[model samples]
Target: EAVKKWVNKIIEENIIAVFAKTECPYCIKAISILKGYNLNSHMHVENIEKNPDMANIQAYLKELTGKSSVPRIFINKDVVGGCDDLVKENDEGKLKERLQKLGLVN
Candidate 1:
Protein backbone atom coordinates (compact mmCIF):
# COMPACT_ATOMS: atom_id res chain seq x y z
CA GLU A 1 0.00 0.00 0.00
CA ALA A 2 2.73 2.42 0.92
CA VAL A 3 4.75 1.53 -2.14
CA LYS A 4 1.69 1.88 -4.33
CA LYS A 5 1.11 5.35 -3.00
CA TRP A 6 4.72 6.28 -3.55
CA VAL A 7 4.63 5.10 -7.16
CA ASN A 8 1.33 6.82 -7.84
CA LYS A 9 2.57 10.01 -6.27
CA ILE A 10 5.65 10.03 -8.46
CA ILE A 11 3.55 9.55 -11.56
CA GLU A 12 0.97 12.07 -10.48
CA GLU A 13 3.44 14.82 -9.75
CA ASN A 14 5.86 14.67 -12.63
CA ILE A 15 5.16 15.69 -16.21
CA ILE A 16 7.84 13.22 -17.21
CA ALA A 17 8.93 10.49 -14.81
CA VAL A 18 11.54 7.87 -15.59
CA PHE A 19 11.88 4.85 -13.34
CA ALA A 20 15.37 3.76 -14.23
CA LYS A 21 18.76 2.62 -13.02
CA THR A 22 21.92 4.71 -13.14
CA GLU A 23 23.92 2.41 -15.36
CA CYS A 24 21.38 0.71 -17.61
CA PRO A 25 22.17 1.43 -21.24
CA TYR A 26 18.53 1.46 -22.25
CA CYS A 27 17.78 3.92 -19.47
CA ILE A 28 20.66 6.07 -20.58
CA LYS A 29 19.39 6.10 -24.15
CA ALA A 30 15.85 6.91 -23.17
CA ILE A 31 17.01 9.73 -20.86
CA SER A 32 19.33 11.25 -23.45
CA ILE A 33 16.52 11.31 -25.97
CA LEU A 34 14.21 13.03 -23.54
CA LYS A 35 16.89 15.54 -22.68
CA GLY A 36 17.13 16.33 -26.38
CA TYR A 37 13.57 17.52 -26.10
CA ASN A 38 14.58 20.13 -23.49
CA LEU A 39 12.46 18.72 -20.70
CA ASN A 40 14.85 19.37 -17.84
CA SER A 41 12.70 20.87 -15.09
CA HIS A 42 9.62 18.98 -16.26
CA MET A 43 11.38 15.64 -16.01
CA HIS A 44 12.11 13.39 -13.03
CA VAL A 45 14.27 10.32 -13.35
CA GLU A 46 14.36 7.99 -10.37
CA ASN A 47 17.25 5.60 -10.04
CA ILE A 48 15.32 2.84 -8.41
CA GLU A 49 18.57 0.97 -7.88
CA LYS A 50 19.45 3.52 -5.21
CA ASN A 51 16.18 3.16 -3.39
CA PRO A 52 15.94 0.94 -0.30
CA ASP A 53 12.56 -0.28 -1.52
CA MET A 54 13.83 -1.26 -4.95
CA ALA A 55 12.56 -4.81 -4.95
CA ASN A 56 9.07 -3.75 -4.00
CA ILE A 57 9.30 -0.83 -6.40
CA GLN A 58 10.10 -3.15 -9.27
CA ALA A 59 7.39 -5.58 -8.21
CA TYR A 60 4.80 -2.83 -8.21
CA LEU A 61 6.13 -1.55 -11.53
CA LYS A 62 5.73 -4.98 -13.09
CA GLU A 63 2.17 -5.06 -11.87
CA LEU A 64 1.60 -1.51 -13.03
CA THR A 65 3.36 -1.50 -16.42
CA GLY A 66 3.14 -5.21 -17.25
CA LYS A 67 6.92 -5.59 -17.36
CA SER A 68 9.65 -4.94 -14.80
CA SER A 69 11.94 -2.92 -17.03
CA VAL A 70 14.46 -0.46 -15.65
CA PRO A 71 13.67 2.26 -18.15
CA ARG A 72 9.98 2.54 -17.61
CA ILE A 73 9.32 5.98 -18.98
CA PHE A 74 6.32 8.22 -18.50
CA ILE A 75 5.39 11.48 -20.20
CA ASN A 76 2.50 13.80 -19.53
CA LYS A 77 1.57 11.39 -16.74
CA ASP A 78 1.14 8.65 -19.32
CA VAL A 79 3.29 5.76 -20.45
CA VAL A 80 5.56 6.54 -23.41
CA GLY A 81 7.25 3.18 -22.82
CA GLY A 82 10.96 2.15 -22.71
CA CYS A 83 14.08 2.82 -24.78
CA ASP A 84 13.13 1.11 -28.00
CA ASP A 85 9.62 2.36 -27.65
CA LEU A 86 10.91 5.88 -27.18
CA VAL A 87 13.10 5.48 -30.25
CA LYS A 88 10.13 4.55 -32.36
CA GLU A 89 7.99 7.23 -30.85
CA ASN A 90 10.61 9.86 -31.49
CA ASP A 91 11.37 8.58 -34.97
CA GLU A 92 7.70 8.84 -35.81
CA GLY A 93 7.63 12.41 -34.40
CA LYS A 94 5.08 11.43 -31.77
CA LEU A 95 7.41 12.19 -28.89
CA LYS A 96 8.07 15.77 -29.89
CA GLU A 97 4.46 16.23 -30.88
CA ARG A 98 3.31 15.30 -27.41
CA LEU A 99 5.81 17.64 -25.82
CA GLN A 100 4.82 20.41 -28.18
CA LYS A 101 1.16 19.82 -27.47
CA LEU A 102 1.90 20.14 -23.79
CA GLY A 103 3.81 23.39 -24.36
CA LEU A 104 6.97 21.78 -22.98
CA VAL A 105 9.08 22.63 -26.01
CA ASN A 106 9.07 24.38 -29.35
Candidate 2:
Protein backbone atom coordinates (compact mmCIF):
# COMPACT_ATOMS: atom_id res chain seq x y z
CA GLU A 1 0.00 0.00 0.00
CA ALA A 2 2.84 2.36 0.74
CA VAL A 3 4.34 1.54 -2.62
CA LYS A 4 1.08 2.19 -4.36
CA LYS A 5 0.93 5.59 -2.72
CA TRP A 6 4.43 6.28 -3.91
CA VAL A 7 3.61 5.31 -7.44
CA ASN A 8 0.38 7.29 -7.51
CA LYS A 9 2.06 10.33 -6.04
CA ILE A 10 4.68 10.29 -8.77
CA ILE A 11 2.05 9.94 -11.46
CA GLU A 12 -0.13 12.71 -10.03
CA GLU A 13 2.80 15.05 -9.70
CA ASN A 14 4.67 14.94 -12.99
CA ILE A 15 3.60 16.32 -16.33
CA ILE A 16 5.37 13.36 -17.80
CA ALA A 17 6.37 10.57 -15.44
CA VAL A 18 8.35 7.41 -16.00
CA PHE A 19 9.43 4.58 -13.72
CA ALA A 20 12.16 2.65 -15.45
CA LYS A 21 15.41 0.77 -15.12
CA THR A 22 18.42 2.60 -16.47
CA GLU A 23 19.97 -0.45 -18.09
CA CYS A 24 16.75 -1.73 -19.64
CA PRO A 25 16.62 -1.48 -23.41
CA TYR A 26 12.87 -1.01 -23.46
CA CYS A 27 13.18 1.85 -20.99
CA ILE A 28 15.75 3.51 -23.23
CA LYS A 29 13.39 3.09 -26.16
CA ALA A 30 10.44 4.46 -24.20
CA ILE A 31 12.37 7.60 -23.35
CA SER A 32 13.36 7.87 -27.00
CA ILE A 33 9.74 7.73 -28.10
CA LEU A 34 8.78 10.49 -25.65
CA LYS A 35 11.46 12.67 -27.18
CA GLY A 36 10.15 11.93 -30.64
CA TYR A 37 6.83 13.42 -29.60
CA ASN A 38 8.55 16.66 -28.63
CA LEU A 39 6.16 17.12 -25.78
CA ASN A 40 5.27 20.47 -24.29
CA SER A 41 4.82 18.89 -20.88
CA HIS A 42 7.71 18.67 -18.46
CA MET A 43 9.33 15.24 -18.35
CA HIS A 44 10.69 13.33 -15.36
CA VAL A 45 12.48 10.00 -15.19
CA GLU A 46 12.94 7.74 -12.18
CA ASN A 47 15.20 4.76 -12.70
CA ILE A 48 13.72 2.34 -10.22
CA GLU A 49 17.07 0.61 -9.93
CA LYS A 50 18.41 3.59 -8.05
CA ASN A 51 15.97 3.10 -5.23
CA PRO A 52 16.72 0.67 -2.44
CA ASP A 53 13.07 -0.14 -1.85
CA MET A 54 12.17 -0.59 -5.48
CA ALA A 55 11.21 -4.22 -5.20
CA ASN A 56 7.97 -3.25 -3.52
CA ILE A 57 7.49 -0.37 -5.90
CA GLN A 58 7.88 -2.63 -8.90
CA ALA A 59 5.47 -5.09 -7.38
CA TYR A 60 2.93 -2.35 -6.89
CA LEU A 61 3.49 -1.25 -10.45
CA LYS A 62 2.71 -4.73 -11.67
CA GLU A 63 -0.58 -4.56 -9.85
CA LEU A 64 -1.30 -1.11 -11.26
CA THR A 65 -0.33 -1.95 -14.84
CA GLY A 66 -0.49 -5.72 -15.04
CA LYS A 67 2.64 -5.92 -17.20
CA SER A 68 5.59 -6.16 -14.78
CA SER A 69 7.52 -4.11 -17.31
CA VAL A 70 9.85 -1.20 -17.06
CA PRO A 71 9.72 2.08 -18.98
CA ARG A 72 6.28 2.68 -17.64
CA ILE A 73 5.47 6.02 -19.18
CA PHE A 74 2.87 8.44 -17.93
CA ILE A 75 1.54 11.74 -19.22
CA ASN A 76 -1.28 14.00 -18.14
CA LYS A 77 -1.00 12.27 -14.80
CA ASP A 78 -1.68 8.84 -16.23
CA VAL A 79 0.40 5.75 -16.79
CA VAL A 80 0.13 5.28 -20.53
CA GLY A 81 2.44 2.29 -20.99
CA GLY A 82 5.89 0.94 -21.74
CA CYS A 83 8.01 1.22 -24.92
CA ASP A 84 6.15 -1.18 -27.19
CA ASP A 85 2.74 0.12 -26.22
CA LEU A 86 3.65 3.77 -26.66
CA VAL A 87 5.56 3.15 -29.87
CA LYS A 88 2.72 1.23 -31.40
CA GLU A 89 0.18 3.85 -30.38
CA ASN A 90 2.31 6.61 -31.82
CA ASP A 91 2.66 4.64 -35.05
CA GLU A 92 -1.08 4.08 -35.12
CA GLY A 93 -1.54 7.88 -35.15
CA LYS A 94 -3.02 8.05 -31.65
CA LEU A 95 -0.18 9.83 -29.90
CA LYS A 96 -0.20 12.88 -32.15
CA GLU A 97 -3.69 13.78 -31.07
CA ARG A 98 -2.82 13.51 -27.41
CA LEU A 99 0.19 15.69 -28.01
CA GLN A 100 -2.05 18.16 -29.75
CA LYS A 101 -4.10 18.48 -26.56
CA LEU A 102 -0.96 19.62 -24.78
CA GLY A 103 -0.10 21.79 -27.77
CA LEU A 104 3.04 19.78 -28.38
CA VAL A 105 2.44 19.06 -32.07
CA ASN A 106 -0.48 19.70 -34.29
- What lDDT does the true structure give each of the candidates? 0.88, 0.79
- Across 1-106, the per-residue lDDT of candidate 2 in tens digits comes to 6777888888888777888986898888778788777752567788888988788878877877776678888877656878888888788987776778877776
Residues 1-106, candidate 1: write the lDDT tens digits: 9988998888889999999987899999889989988898888899999999999999988887777878998887777778888999999989889999999988
Deviation of model 2 at 83, angstroms: 0.5
Q: What is residue 31's positional error in candidate 2, in angstroms?
A: 0.4
Question: Poorest 10 consecutive residues of model 2 by lDDT?
Answer: 35-44
TM agreement with the true structure for every prediction: 0.93, 0.86
TM-score for model 1? 0.93
Q: Which stretches in model 2 have alpha-carbon errors above 4 Å?
A: none
